[PDB]
C-alpha cells in the first residue's frame, strides 16, 4: 500500500485569531484600530443617539391622526345633547329603517 494516505493537497485548518492579543481595546469591530474605533463611534452615535432617542421622541409626539381626542369630544357633545332631549342614548339600528326597503314575503 504505497498510497500517501493523503486524499489531496490541502491547506491546514487555520487557528482562530484573537483581536485582543494584537490590539487591546479592540471593540470587536476590525483588526485596524482606527477603523475599529471609528466604526464603534458611528454605530453608537447613529443607533443609540439618533435612532433610539430622536425616533422615540418623534413617535411619542405624533399628532392625533387616529382621532382619539376628536372621538372623545364628539361623544361628549353627543351625550350632552341626547341626555337633554331625553333620547335613549345610542340607537339599536345603525341605519334608519325608513330608508331601508325590505322585500315583502307574502308566504
Amino acid at each position: 500500500p504505497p498510497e500517501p494516505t493523503i486524499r489531496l493537497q490541502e491547506d491546514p485548518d487555520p487557528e482562530d485569531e484573537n483581536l485582543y492579543e494584537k490590539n487591546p481595546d479592540s471593540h470587536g469591530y476590525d483588526k485596524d484600530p482606527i477603523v475599529d474605533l471609528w466604526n464603534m463611534r458611528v454605530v453608537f452615535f447613529f443607533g443609540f443617539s439618533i435612532v433610539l432617542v430622536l425616533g422615540s421622541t418623534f413617535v411619542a409626539y405624533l399628532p392625533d391622526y387616529r382621532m382619539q381626542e376628536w372621538a372623545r369630544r364628539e361623544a361628549e357633545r353627543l351625550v350632552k345633547y341626547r341626555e337633554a332631549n331625553g333620547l335613549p342614548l345610542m340607537e339599536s339600528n345603525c341605519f334608519d329603517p325608513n330608508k331601508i326597503q325590505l322585500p315583502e314575503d307574502e308566504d
Partner: protein, 459 residues
C-alpha cells in the same frame, strides 16, 4: 413610498464603490439613517390607509413590519462583520448586496397594492435567502436545507398563483382596495373549497404550520447568523401578513375550513414546546420555539376576530425581535466554542456576566413576562380563543407552562452551574456584541410603553 425605496436601492452602488475597509461603516450608518426615515410611516389614521400611489400603500399592519425590516439590516451587518473577517472584499460586497436586495424585496412586498405584485416580491425574497444559506454556510447539509426551504415554499405557492389569476379573471381586479369594497360571499362548494386551500396553504407553509414545519430547523441551523436573523424575524411574518390580507375574500368559508388548521396548530404548539425540552442544540431549540409562537399566530389569524388580529400583530413583532436576539446570543457562544451544542460550554455567567444578563433578559422576553408586548399578544390571542371556545384555554395553559420551562432550561444549561474546565479560549465579550444585544432589546421595552403602535389596523 419611494423616499424609502430609493435610498435602499442607492445602498448598492454605495457599497460597491466603497473603499475596501469602509464597507461595514458605510453600510451600517446608511442603514440606520434609512431606518430613521422609515419611522415616518408609523403615524397612521383610523381611516382607510396611507395610499401613496396606485402601486404602494401603507397600513398600521404594514408600518410596524416595514420599520422592523428596516431596523433589522444594521443588526445583521453588525452580526455578520465578525465571521466574514478572513474573506475577500468582493465576496463581502456580494454578501452586503444580498442583504440589501432582501430588504428591498421585503419593503416592496409589505406595501404591494396588488396581489400579483405581492406574490412576485413574496417569491423574489426566496433567491437571496437561498443563496445566503447555501453559499456562506458552514456545514455540508446547507445544500439539503436550501433545497428543503426552496421546494416547500414553491410547492405551497404554485397553486396560489393559479388561484390569484383565476380570482382576477372572475372578479376583474386583484387590487386590495377593490377587493375589500367588492367582497362577496363564497358558496360552500368543492371548487370554492379548493380555491380556499390554494389561497391559504402558501401562507400556511411559511409560518410554518405544524405539519409543514420541517424545512425550518434545517434552514435555521445551517444558515449564517444574518440568515437566521432574517428568517426568524421577518420571513416568517410574510405568511401571517398574507393571510391577514387574503382572508377577506375567503369568508364565510373560513369557519368550516379552519378546523383542520386550528387543531393542527393547537396541538403543534404543545408538540414543539415539548420538543424544545429535549434538544441538544441551541439553534434547533430557538427554531422550535419560533414554530410554537407562529402556530399561536396561525390560531389567532384563523379565529379572525379583532382581538385576534391585534394579538397576532403584536406577537409577530415581539417574536421577531426576541428570536433575532436569541440567535445572536447563540452565535456569540458559537464563535467562541465552535460546537453549537448547549452541554459543552457551561457556567458562562461566571466568565461573562453582562452577556449572562443579556441572556436573562432575552429568555424573560421569550417567556412572555408582563408588561412586555410578547405577553400583550399572548393574552389578546388567548382571550380571543377563549371567546371562540372555553376549552382552548387548557391547551394554551399547557403551552405557557412548557414555554417557561424550556426558556429557563436554556438559561440554566449554558449560564448556570460549573464552567467546563478544558475550554480556555473564552475571551471577554466585545463592545460590538453588547451593542448588538442592547439594540435588539431596547426597542421591545420602548414599545411596551406605546402598545397601540404595533396593534394593527383593528385598534
Amino acid at each position: 413610498m419611494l423616499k424609502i425605496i430609493i435610498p435602499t436601492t442607492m445602498l448598492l452602488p454605495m457599497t460597491w464603490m466603497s473603499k475596501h475597509n469602509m464597507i461595514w461603516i458605510n453600510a451600517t450608518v446608511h442603514s440606520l439613517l434609512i431606518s430613521l426615515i422609515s419611522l415616518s410611516l408609523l403615524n397612521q389614521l383610523g381611516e382607510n390607509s396611507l395610499n401613496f400611489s396606485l402601486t404602494f400603500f401603507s397600513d398600521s399592519l404594514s408600518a410596524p413590519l416595514l420599520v422592523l425590516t428596516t431596523w433589522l439590516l444594521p443588526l445583521m451587518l453588525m452580526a455578520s462583520q465578525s465571521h466574514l473577517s478572513k474573506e475577500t472584499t468582493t465576496r463581502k460586497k456580494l454578501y452586503i448586496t444580498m442583504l440589501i436586495l432582501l430588504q428591498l424585496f421585503l419593503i416592496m412586498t409589505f406595501t404591494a397594492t396588488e396581489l400579483i405584485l405581492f406574490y412576485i416580491l413574496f417569491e423574489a425574497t426566496l433567491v437571496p435567502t437561498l443563496i445566503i444559506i447555501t453559499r456562506w454556510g458552514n456545514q455540508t447539509e446547507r445544500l439539503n436545507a436550501g433545497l428543503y426551504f426552496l421546494f416547500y415554499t414553491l410547492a405551497g405557492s404554485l397553486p396560489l398563483l393559479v388561484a390569484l389569476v383565476y380570482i382576477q379573471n372572475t372578479t376583474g381586479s386583484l387590487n386590495f382596495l377593490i377587493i375589500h369594497y367588492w367582497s362577496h360571499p363564497l358558496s360552500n362548494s368543492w371548487s370554492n373549497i379548493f380555491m380556499w386551500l390554494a389561497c391559504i396553504m402558501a401562507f400556511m407553509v411559511k409560518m410554518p404550520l405544524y405539519g409543514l414545519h420541517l424545512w425550518l430547523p434545517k434552514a435555521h441551523v445551517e444558515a449564517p447568523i444574518a440568515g437566521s436573523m432574517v428568517l426568524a424575524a421577518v420571513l416568517l411574518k410574510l405568511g401571517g401578513y398574507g393571510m391577514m390580507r387574503i382572508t377577506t375574500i375567503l369568508n364565510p368559508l373560513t369557519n368550516y375550513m379552519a378546523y383542520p388548521f386550528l387543531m393542527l396548530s393547537m396541538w403543534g404548539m404543545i408538540m414543539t414546546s415539548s420538543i424544545c425540552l429535549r434538544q441538544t442544540d441551541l439553534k434547533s431549540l430557538i427554531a422550535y420555539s419560533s414554530v410554537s409562537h407562529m402556530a399561536l399566530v396561525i390560531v389567532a389569524i384563523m379565529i379572525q376576530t379583532p382581538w385576534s388580529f391585534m394579538g397576532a400583530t403584536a406577537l409577530m413583532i415581539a417574536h421577531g425581535l426576541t428570536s433575532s436576539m436569541l440567535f445572536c446570543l447563540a452565535n456569540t457562544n458559537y464563535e467562541r466554542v465552535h460546537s453549537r451544542t448547549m452541554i459543552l460550554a457551561r457556567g458562562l455567567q461566571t466568565l461573562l456576566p453582562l452577556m449572562a444578563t443579556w441572556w436573562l433578559v432575552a429568555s424573560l422576553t421569550n417567556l412572555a413576562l408582563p408588561p412586555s408586548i410578547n405577553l400583550i399578544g399572548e393574552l389578546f390571542i388567548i382571550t380571543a380563543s377563549f371567546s371562540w371556545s372555553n376549552i382552548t384555554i387548557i391547551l394554551m395553559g399547557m403551552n405557557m407552562m412548557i414555554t417557561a420551562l424550556y426558556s429557563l432550561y436554556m438559561l440554566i444549561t449554558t449560564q448556570r452551574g460549573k464552567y467546563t474546565h478544558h475550554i480556555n479560549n473564552i475571551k471577554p465579550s466585545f463592545t460590538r456584541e453588547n451593542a448588538l444585544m442592547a439594540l435588539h432589546i431596547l426597542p421591545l421595552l420602548l414599545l411596551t410603553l406605546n402598545p397601540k403602535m404595533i396593534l394593527g389596523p383593528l385598534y
